[PDB]
RNA sequence: AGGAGAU
């Protein structure tokens, strides 16, 4: 698992909330309604909001 | 860090 810093945001700076493409958004996607995945390990099991990795990769101290 | 395009 790897990536870069990001936050709960909208529009530019993020991608289609359904597939992960940039030329469109989740409401203009061209595939069926996918499960959204952890922005950190892509595990649908949980969310980055609970990623078992970030707990020791970037647990931060502010939110 | 959790949805819908500024949070
Ligand atoms: Zn898409
Ligand atoms: Zn995760």
Coordinates of C-alpha atoms (C1' of nucleotides) and ligand atoms in Angstrom, one line a residue:
Chain A
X1 CA 0.0 0.0 0.0
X2 CA 1.2 3.5 -1.0
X3 CA 0.0 7.0 -1.8
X4 CA 0.2 10.7 -0.9
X5 CA -1.4 13.1 1.5
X6 CA -5.1 13.8 1.0
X7 CA -8.3 14.8 2.9
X8 CA -12.1 14.7 2.7
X9 CA -12.4 17.2 -0.2
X10 CA -14.4 17.8 -3.4
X11 CA -13.9 18.7 -7.1
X12 CA -10.3 19.0 -8.3
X13 CA -7.7 17.2 -6.1
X14 CA -9.8 14.0 -6.1
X15 CA -11.3 11.5 -8.6
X16 CA -14.6 9.7 -9.5
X17 CA -15.9 8.5 -6.1
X18 CA -17.0 5.2 -7.8
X19 CA -14.1 4.0 -10.0
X20 CA -11.2 6.4 -9.4
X21 CA -11.0 8.2 -12.8
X22 CA -10.3 11.9 -13.2
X23 CA -11.9 12.6 -16.6
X24 CA -15.3 12.3 -14.8
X25 CA -17.1 11.9 -11.5
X26 CA -19.1 9.1 -9.8
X27 CA -22.3 10.4 -11.4
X28 CA -20.8 10.3 -14.9
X29 CA -18.9 7.0 -14.4
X30 CA -19.2 4.4 -17.1
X31 CA -19.1 1.2 -15.0
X32 CA -21.7 -0.1 -12.4
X33 CA -21.9 1.3 -8.9
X34 CA -18.6 0.0 -7.3
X35 CA -17.9 -0.2 -3.6
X36 CA -15.8 2.7 -2.4
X37 CA -12.5 1.6 -1.0
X38 CA -10.1 2.7 1.7
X39 CA -8.1 5.6 0.2
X40 CA -5.1 4.0 1.9
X41 CA -5.1 0.3 1.3
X42 CA -8.1 0.0 -1.1
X43 CA -9.8 -2.4 1.3
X44 CA -13.6 -2.1 1.1
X45 CA -13.6 -4.0 4.4
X46 CA -13.0 -0.6 6.1
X47 CA -12.3 3.1 5.2
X48 CA -9.1 5.1 5.5
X49 CA -11.0 6.5 8.5
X50 CA -10.1 3.2 10.1
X51 CA -7.2 1.9 8.0
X52 CA -5.2 -0.6 10.0
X53 CA -2.1 0.6 8.2
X54 CA -2.3 4.4 8.8
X55 CA -2.4 3.6 12.5
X56 CA 1.4 3.2 12.2
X57 CA 2.0 4.9 8.8
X58 CA 0.4 8.3 9.4
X59 CA -1.8 8.3 12.5
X60 CA -1.4 12.2 12.8
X61 CA -2.4 14.2 15.8
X62 CA -5.0 16.6 14.4
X63 CA -8.4 16.3 12.6
Chain B
rA1 C1' -10.3 11.2 6.2
rG2 C1' -15.9 8.9 3.6
rG3 C1' -18.8 9.7 -0.5
rA4 C1' -21.6 13.0 -4.9
rG5 C1' -17.7 17.5 -6.8
rA6 C1' -15.4 22.5 -1.4
rU7 C1' -14.7 20.7 1.8
Ligands
LIG1 ZN1 -15.6 6.5 -12.4
LIG2 ZN1 -7.2 0.8 4.6

